[PDB]
A paper describes a structure:
Therefore, given our observations, we sought to validate our findings and confirm the position of metal ions by substitution of Mg2+ with Mn2+ and identify ion positions using diffraction methods. Although Mg2+ is essential for SAMHD1 catalysis, Mn2+ still supports dNTP hydrolysis with similar catalytic parameters, as is observed in other phosphohydrolase enzymes. 2Fo − Fc maps contoured at high σ were then used to locate and confirm the position of the highly X-ray scattering Mn2+ ions in the active and allosteric sites in the structure. A further effect of the D137N substitution is that D137N-SAMHD1 is activated by xanthosine-5′-triphosphate (XTP) rather than GTP through AL1-binding but nevertheless maintains comparable catalytic parameters for dNTP hydrolysis as those observed for wt-SAMHD1 and GTP.
Here, sequences at the N and C termini of the HD-domain stabilise inter-monomer protein–protein interactions and incorporate four pairs of allosteric nucleotide-binding sites, AL1 and AL2, which regulate the enzyme through combined binding of G-based (AL1) and 2′-deoxynucleoside (AL2) triphosphates. Using combined biophysical and X-ray structural studies incorporating nucleotide analogues along with mutagenesis experiments we have now discovered that SAMHD1 uses a bi-metallic Fe–Mg centre to catalyse dNTP hydrolysis in a reaction similar to those catalysed by HD domains in both human and bacterial phosphodiesterase PDE enzymes.
Numbering used by the authors:
A (entry chain A), B (entry chain B), C (entry chain A), D (entry chain B): 114 to 276, 284 to 599
Write the structure that this text describes.
Amino acid sequence: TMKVINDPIHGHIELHPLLVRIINTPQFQRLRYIKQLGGGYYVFPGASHNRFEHSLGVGYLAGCLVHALGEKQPELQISERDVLCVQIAGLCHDLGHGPFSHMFDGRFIPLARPEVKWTHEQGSVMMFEHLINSNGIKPVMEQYGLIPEEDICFIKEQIVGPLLWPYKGRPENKSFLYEIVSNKRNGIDVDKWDYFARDCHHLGIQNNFDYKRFIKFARVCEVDNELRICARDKEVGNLYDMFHTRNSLHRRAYQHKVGNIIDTMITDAFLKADDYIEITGAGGKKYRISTAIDDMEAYTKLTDNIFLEILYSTDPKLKDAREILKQIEYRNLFKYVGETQPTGQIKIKREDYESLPKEVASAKPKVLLDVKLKAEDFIVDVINMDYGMQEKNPIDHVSFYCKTAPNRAIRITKNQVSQLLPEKFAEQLIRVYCKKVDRKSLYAARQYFVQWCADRNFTKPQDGDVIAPLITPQKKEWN
Amino acid sequence: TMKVINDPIHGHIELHPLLVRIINTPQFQRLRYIKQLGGGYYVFPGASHNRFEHSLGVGYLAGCLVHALGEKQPELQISERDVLCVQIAGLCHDLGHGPFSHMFDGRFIPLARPEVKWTHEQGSVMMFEHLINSNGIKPVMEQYGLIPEEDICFIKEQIVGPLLWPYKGRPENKSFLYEIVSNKRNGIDVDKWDYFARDCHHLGIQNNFDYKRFIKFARVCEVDNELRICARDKEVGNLYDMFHTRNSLHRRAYQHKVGNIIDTMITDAFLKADDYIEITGAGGKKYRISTAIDDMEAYTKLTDNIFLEILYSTDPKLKDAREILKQIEYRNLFKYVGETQPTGQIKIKREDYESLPKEVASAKPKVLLDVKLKAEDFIVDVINMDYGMQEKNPIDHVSFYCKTAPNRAIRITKNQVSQLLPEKFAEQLIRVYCKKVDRKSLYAARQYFVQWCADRNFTKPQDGDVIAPLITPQKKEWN
Amino acid sequence: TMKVINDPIHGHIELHPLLVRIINTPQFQRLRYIKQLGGGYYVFPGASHNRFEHSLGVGYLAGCLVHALGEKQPELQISERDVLCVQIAGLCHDLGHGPFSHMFDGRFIPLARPEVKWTHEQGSVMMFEHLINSNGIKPVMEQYGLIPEEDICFIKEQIVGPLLWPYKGRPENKSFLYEIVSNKRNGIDVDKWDYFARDCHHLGIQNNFDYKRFIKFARVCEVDNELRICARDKEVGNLYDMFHTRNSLHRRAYQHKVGNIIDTMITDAFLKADDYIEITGAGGKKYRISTAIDDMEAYTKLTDNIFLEILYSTDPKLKDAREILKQIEYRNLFKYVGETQPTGQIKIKREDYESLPKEVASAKPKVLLDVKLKAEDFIVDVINMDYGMQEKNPIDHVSFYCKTAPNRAIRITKNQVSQLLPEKFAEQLIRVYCKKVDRKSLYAARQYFVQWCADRNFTKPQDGDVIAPLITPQKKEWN
Amino acid sequence: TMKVINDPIHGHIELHPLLVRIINTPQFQRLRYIKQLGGGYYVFPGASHNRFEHSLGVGYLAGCLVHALGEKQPELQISERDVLCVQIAGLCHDLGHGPFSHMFDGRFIPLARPEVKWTHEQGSVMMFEHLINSNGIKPVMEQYGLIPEEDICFIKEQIVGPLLWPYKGRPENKSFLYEIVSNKRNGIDVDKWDYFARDCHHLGIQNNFDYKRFIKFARVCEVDNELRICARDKEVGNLYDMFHTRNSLHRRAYQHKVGNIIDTMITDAFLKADDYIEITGAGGKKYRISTAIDDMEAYTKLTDNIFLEILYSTDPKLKDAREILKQIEYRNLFKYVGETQPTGQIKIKREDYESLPKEVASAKPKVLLDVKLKAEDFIVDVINMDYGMQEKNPIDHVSFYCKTAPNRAIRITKNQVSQLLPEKFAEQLIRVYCKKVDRKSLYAARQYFVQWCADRNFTKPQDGDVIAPLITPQKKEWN
Ligand SMILES: Nc1ncnc2c1ncn2[C@H]1C[C@H](O)[C@@H](COP(=O)(O)NP(=O)(O)OP(=O)(O)O)O1
Ligand SMILES: Nc1ncnc2c1ncn2[C@H]1C[C@H](O)[C@@H](COP(=O)(O)NP(=O)(O)OP(=O)(O)O)O1
Ligand SMILES: Nc1ncnc2c1ncn2[C@H]1C[C@H](O)[C@@H](COP(=O)(O)NP(=O)(O)OP(=O)(O)O)O1
Ligand SMILES: Nc1ncnc2c1ncn2[C@H]1C[C@H](O)[C@@H](COP(=O)(O)NP(=O)(O)OP(=O)(O)O)O1
Ligand SMILES: [Fe+3]
Ligand SMILES: [Fe+3]
Ligand SMILES: [Fe+3]
Ligand SMILES: [Fe+3]
Ligand SMILES: [Mn+2]
Ligand SMILES: [Mn+2]
Ligand SMILES: [Mn+2]
Ligand SMILES: [Mn+2]
Ligand SMILES: [Mn+2]
Ligand SMILES: [Mn+2]
Ligand SMILES: [Mn+2]
Ligand SMILES: [Mn+2]
C-alpha cells in the first residue's frame, strides 16, 4: 500500500512502494544535503531547501500529468507501467547534482576539468544506475510489471535525452511521455513547475504561473506522425507568462549578483582544495572533488558537506581554500562593480571569456588614481539569459488545440497573441567584480569598468554618472 | 484613539477618528454594494469583493507610503496634516464608481449620454463634496488641525488631478504627495498596489509584485526643480514587472471575453431600463440611471442593487431589460466568435467603434450562406491595452537613485535593462460576439468575422483554420 | 464534457454537465446575492463571500471524498450514479438560506413566525424540488443513469436527514454516503471543510485544519451491521482540533458581539417591514418576507437585496424599518454592555429568553444614576456554543481503524488522547446590549448589568471592576 | 545606513549596522548549519529551515514589539539604545543551540554528561560573549551609544534570565523589556511568534495565531510596582488559543513519534562517537562532542555537519556510530510500539526514566512467548507536554486592560472566559519503541508493552485490542 508524505508545496502525497524503495537509499538520501539554490541561501535566508524535496515534487507532478492524460484519453493506452516509469524518472531526474547544485556543473567542473564535458543530468543517469544496482531494485521493478532492459532505458532517456525516431525505450505512439519530466521540444515540463512553486515559497517572491490550470487543459494530439502533448489555444498567454516568470526568477534570485559571487568564491575554494581532498570510492580507490563524478560510490559522499569539511579543517594544505570560506563568513566578499550588456546584435563567444579581465585592466581612464590594477584583480561573469532554447521563441515549438476540433493540433505565432511580448529571446549580461575590497581599489575598478564599457560600445551602466562622473562624458550617445 | 479593522490583505489597520467619521456615512458605505470587478464575478466566483474594502486598503497604503517617506526624510517636513489628507484621498478615491465599477463609466455612460465627458474620478470629487457637506465633516477636520479651504482642494487634486505649477492644494516642495494615490507622472501608485493584491487573493491568480519592497527603497529627490518620489536603481526590473503584471491581470481576468460580454449585457439591460427607472435625488427630483450622476443624493442610491431591481420587477415596460438579465441567469450569453488585432501601425479610432458591427455584417465571404446576419446581430468590443500612458513607456518617466549618491536622481532607459522587454507599450484587441446563439448563426458569424479580418488586414484568429477553413487560404499574409 | 471553474480556495474544478444545468438556474444563481456570514461583513470587510461559491465548494469536496472512497475500496460498489447524487446534494445543500444566511432562520423567522418550526435545510429540500421541476432537470438526470423516484429522495435525505434503518434512498450497505454532505452521526462533513477554508481566506484569520489529510486516511468499515466512514487512529488529535477550530471561528467571527448586534438590527428592520413588503409568487399571489418561505417562486426573489430595497425606499410605511438601517450605516449601533455566563451547571432555558431584559431592568444597583431604564431598552442575546451535538463529545461518535487491522473499527475515548482537552462540550454566553446610546444611559446600563450578574451568581464580567467599580465589591467571591 | 534582507515569513527587514557586524561572524553564521527541527526534517521534508533565519526573525520581531510600545507610549522613555539591545538579544538568543537543536540539550548532553545542568540558553550567553570578544564588537557598540558594562549584561539577561529586583541590566521602570525575547512571567514572547509562523510555513501545517493583532493591542501598565506588558481584555481567548496552538504543533510535528526516534538514533550515534571525534578549540586543545560545550571556539565548529562526518568516515572505531546512521538512511528505524499516559495524578519523575525499559522487559504476559526480549531492546521516551509553566495556567500570569481604563491592569480567570478550556495544563506521554525490527520481536514487544500499561494502571493504548487482544480483557478499568 501507499506511504503518505507531507510536502508544504504539494500537500499530502502518495508514494508507491517501488518509489519508497528508491527513496530509502544512500544515493537518494544524499540529496537532503545539497541546497537547491546553492549560494543563493547566502542572499535569500529562506532558501534552505534541498534537492531532496524538489525531487519528491517532480516525481509527484510527473505522475499527476501522466494520470490526467490517461484518465481523459484511455485510447492512449497509458499503462501502470508507463505511469511508474514517468514517476521514477521524475523522482530521480536530479540525482546527479553536486554540491551547491548548478554551481557544481556550471562553474566548478568546467574550470577544474576542461577535459570532460559533464552535466548533472549525465550524473543523474549514472547515479540512477548505481542506485538500482547497489540496492537490489531490479527485482522490485519486475515485481510491479516493469521490464528492466526496456524501462531502465526509458527512465534514463527521460532524464538526459537519447543515448527517424531516436528513442529505444518507447515508440512514437508514446512520445508524449518524453515531454513530462524534461521536455526537449519546448521546455514546458513538471520540473519547472515544481521549482517555480518551491523556490518562490522559500525565497519570499511569489509565483504567478498556475500548473494545475495547465494540466486540466492539456491533451495529446497527432503532430507530424507522433503523439504529443498540446495545450488549449487560450493558454498561449499563460505559456508566454511561464517563460517570463522563469526569466524574472533568474533576474531577481538565481543570477543575483551576490549569489553568483558567493558561488564563485566557493568554486575558488574548491579549486584550491581539489589537489588535497580524498574521497573513498569503489574498491578503496581515492578520488578528488573533480573526479568523484567518475565513480558513483565516491560521488554518493560528495555533498554541500564539503564546504564545512574545508571550513573546519586544520590541514595546512587547505589553508588557501579555508581562508576564502572565512572571507564569505565575515562577509568580505569580492565587490560588485557593475553590469553591462553588449549592443549591435554582437555576441560574446565562450572562447573570449578568459580574456575579459585583461581587457578591463588595460582600459586607460583619463582620471588618475591612487592604485593601478592587474587582470588578476577582476572577475568578469558572463550570463546567457534566455527562454531555454538559445535565440528561439519556445512557444513556436508548442502545439495547441481549439475547443471546436479537439483532436487537431495548430500553431500560434507571436503576432496572433500580442505586440507587448518580447522582441528577442536571448541576451547576455556581463557582471564585473573586483577582488580588492578597500575604497581606493573599488573607486579605481569603477573607473576601469566604465571606461571599458565606453571602449566596447556596451550599454551605459545604470549608476555610471554617479560612479564614474569623469568618464560618462566621453560618449555623446550617453546623454 | 484609533479604531482597528481586520482586512484579509493588509491585516490589522488603524483608522484615525477623522477617517472613521468619513467612513461611517451613506456616501462611503454605498461602496459595500458595488463589486470591484463588475461582471467578473460571473466568471471568477471568488470575485465577490466590493469597492469598500479596496478603498480601506488604498487609504491604508497611502498612509504607509507617506509615513515611510516622513520617517526616513524629516527634512521633507511632512506634517500630520499632510498624512491625514493623503489617507483621506486614498480612502475616498473611488467614491464615484457606479454599478459594476468600470462597466458604468467604460460602457454605460458613454452609450447612454454621449454628450458628456464623465469618469468615476470626477464622480469621486463630487461624491466627496456631498459626503463632507451632508455629514458635518468640515468641523471635524478643523478639530484635527486640517484647514478645509486648502485641504479639501488638496484631497480632490490627489484623486482627479488639477481642477508653471498647476496645483492649488500644496506647493512644489510637496509635489511628491501627489504621486501616492493617483500618479499622473507614471502610474506607480498605491491604488494599483492594493488592487493587485486584493484582486489576486479573490480571483485565485497569484500576484508577483512586492509593494513593500518598493516602499523600503523609495526616496524623495529633487528632479527638475520639483521634489519627487524616486526608486532605487536596482528596482527598475521590478517596475517593468509591475506593469507586466497589470497587463497579465487584464488579459487573464479584467478583460476575460466572457466577463466583458456579461458587462455588455448588463449595460444593454440598463440602456433598456433607463427611460423607466426613477431614483429620488435632492429636493424630491426624479433622476434616471444615466442622470443620477448629476445629483449626488441620487447617485448615493445607485449601486449593483439596480441589477436586482430590474430582474425582480413586474412593470411591463422593463420586460425588455428584464429578459436580458434572465439570459445571464440561465447562461444564454451572447456567443464569443473570436479575437483579432490590427497590424502595421493602423489604429482604430473611438469615432469608428459604432461602425464595426456593420462592417462585419457587410463582409462578402465566397462560401454561400444559408441565412444572412444584420449589424444588430454583432458586438465588436475594442480594448486598448497599454502600460497606462497610451504608447509611452512609463519607466521613461520614473526617476531612480544609486546607493553611492542617494540625493541624486537619474534616468534609466529600456536598453540599459534588458532586450527581453516589450518593443511596444500599447495595442488593441478586437473581440467579436454574436447575439444569435444557435449553431447555424454561429457558423455564419465565424465566416463573416474571419472574412472581415482578411478584408482589414487584421491578424489571423488563433482558431481561424478550424472555424473558417475555406477562408484562411485566401490571405497570403497568413501562410 | 467538463466545464472548468476557478475558485480561489479549491483551484480549478470540473463540473459535470448535469451540475452545470443545475447551476444555471434562477434558483441556484440566487445564492450569488446572499452573504455567507450575513452581518459579519459589517465587522470583517473581507467577508463579502456569498453562498454561491460555498455551494460550488461543498459540491466539489463531496465528490472528492466519494471518489477517494471508491478508488481505494472498489468492493463498496460506489457507482457513477452515487457519485453524482453526492455531488448534487453538496451543490444544493444550502439552496434554502435566506437573506444574511443564519440571521434568517436563526433570528428572523423565529421572531416573525412562531407558528412554524423552519430551517434553511427544509428550505433547501423545497427549493431543490422547485429548481428541478421548473427547469426540466428530471430528463437530464435520467440521461446520466439517475433514477429520480429513488435519487431525488437520496439527495433530499443527505441535505435534511430522514423525511431499524430510516432511509428510502439507499440501503445500509451504502450508509457511508449519508456521512459526506451533512453528517448526522458526528458532524464531520465536507460542508465544514469548505466553510473553514473559505471563511478564513475572507475573514483574515487563518485555518489550521487539513481536510486533504483527513480524506487520505478515511476508510469505510463495518460498524453495527452498517458500512461507515472511519478515520485512522492517528487522526484523533486532528478531529479534536477540527472542533476546536470550529469553536474558535464562532468566538472570533461568527458570534462577534457586533456582528450579532447588526444581525439583530437587520432582523428588527425586517420585522418592521414584514407587514408592508409584497413578493410575487406562483399564480401572482402575494407573500411577505416571513411567508415567502411557503412558496419557492417567491423565495427565489428573496435575497440580501431586501436590505437595500428597504434602505432605498420612500414609502412612508417603511420609515420605521428604514431608520434602523440608516442607524447601521451611520454606525449608531446599539451598545455592547458586556458578556457573562451562568455557573453551577445551571442552563438558561429557551422559554425564559424573553424574560431577561426585564430582569436586567429590575436590578437595584446601590449607586444612583441620572436616567432610569425600562426592559424595552435592553437586548439579551443568549448563545449556545457547542461541539455540534449539544452536551456530547462528537469524537465519541467517530469510528477509527489501526494500521494493523484496517477493516476493524474501534473507539477512542478522551482519556486515551489527552488530559488537556475540554472537560465539557457545551456552554452558554449571555450578551447584553443597550438601545440607548448616549453616555449617561450607557453608564447606567453598565450598573444594571453588573448588578444583575451579581444577583444571578453569573461570572464576573471581564471589565466589571472598571465599568461598575461600586458594584463588584458586593460579591466577596469576585476578589 | 540600513541593510535590507528578504525573509519569506517577515518580508523585507532592516538591519542596523551594529546588527550586521554581529551577524557577519563565524559564531552567528554557524547557525546556518543547525536545523531548527532537528530530526523533524526526516519526517517533514519541508523542514529544512535552520536556526539562522529563525534568529533573524526573532531579532526583527523583538524590535517591532519594542518600537510599537515606544510609539504608543513616549512616557516609557524607550531609547534607541534599549531598542538595539532588544534587537540584539532577539538576534542572539539561540546562538547556543547544538546539532539538531533540542536533540542536543534535550537528549545528548543529559545522557553523555549527567553531571552538568546545561541548556542551549546558557550556551547562548557564552557564545554571545565569545562572539563579542573575538570580533571587536565592544567598540562598535560604543560607536552607536551603547554602554557595554550595562548593555552586555542586559542582553544576556533577556536571553537566559537573571545570572527585591533581580536584574543588573535595567531597572524596574523598564521590566517590560525583559518580557519580549524570552518571557519568564508567562511565556508570551516573540520567539514563539516567529517559530510558529516559520515552522508552519515549512512543515505544511497552517498557523492560526496572529502576532500582529496581539502587538496592536499591547500596552505597558503598572502592575504590583513594576511596569509590564499587558494585553487588551478581548484578546484573552486568542491567548488561550496561542498556547493550544503550541501544544498542537508539538503533537503534530515536534514530538512526532518518528521525529523523536530519529533524534534518538542520532543521539545514540553521537554517544558511540563521543570517545573518538576530536574538535579543535582554544589554544589547540582537543574537545569531544560532549565537551565542546565548555569551549566556544570548539562549539563554533560543532553543527549538523557532525552527522555527515560520522556517516562518511572510515575510522574503524566509528563503525558502531556509523552503522546506526546507515540504519536511518535505509529507513530501518527502531519500531514504534505505542503510546500511553499515566493516570490518577501519578507523575513519572526524571530519576526513574532509565528504569522504564527494564520494567517493560520484566512484564510477565500470561500468553507464552516464543522469544524473550531484554531491557536493551526497548526505548521508553517520556514527554512532558504543558502550557510552558509545568502545571500552571499561564493566562493566570497575564495582565489585561479595558477600553475604558487603559492604564489600569486587571486579571482574568479561566471561568470568566469559557468552560471549553483545558481542565489541566500538563501531562505526560510515554512512547515505547523496539530496536528489534522483525515481526516476531515486534509482536512480543507489543505484549510486553500492553502488559506493562495494565501493570502500571496507565491508559489503554489506542490500538490495544488490536495489538494485544489477549491482554486488554484482563484489565477492568479498560472495559
Ligand atoms: N497531524 C498532522 N498534520 C499534518 N501533517 C502531519 C500530521 N502528522 C504527521 N504529519 C506529516 C508528517 C509526514 O510527512 C506525513 C506522514 O506522517 P504520519 O501520518 O504521522 N505517518 P507515519 O508513517 O508516522 O505513521 P503510520 O506509519 O502509523 O501510518 O504527515
Ligand atoms: N480574535 C480575532 N482574531 C482576528 N480578527 C478579529 C478577532 N476578533 C475580532 N477581529 C476583527 C474584527 C474587526 O475587523 C477587527 C476589530 O474587532 P475587535 O477587536 O473585536 N474590535 P471591537 O471594535 O469590537 O472592540 P472594542 O471596540 O471593544 O475594542 O478585528
Ligand atoms: N489565464 C487564467 N489564469 C487563471 N484563471 C483563469 C485564466 N483565464 C480564465 N480563468 C478562470 C475563469 C473561470 O473561473 C475559469 C474558466 O475560464 P476559461 O478557461 O477562460 N473558460 P471559458 O469557458 O471562458 O472558455 P472556453 O469556453 O473557450 O473553454 O478559469
Ligand atoms: N527583485 C527582488 N525581489 C525580491 N527580493 C529580492 C529582489 N532582489 C533581491 N532580493 C532579496 C535578496 C535579499 O534577501 C534582499 C536584498 O537584496 P538586494 O536588494 O539585491 N540588496 P543588495 O545588498 O544586493 O544591494 P545593494 O547592497 O547594492 O543595495 O532582497
Ligand atoms: Fe530539477
Ligand atoms: Fe481604486
Ligand atoms: Fe453549507
Ligand atoms: Fe528561538
Ligand atoms: Mn536537473
Ligand atoms: Mn530543464
Ligand atoms: Mn479609481
Ligand atoms: Mn490609475
Ligand atoms: Mn446549511
Ligand atoms: Mn452541519
Ligand atoms: Mn531558544
Ligand atoms: Mn521559551
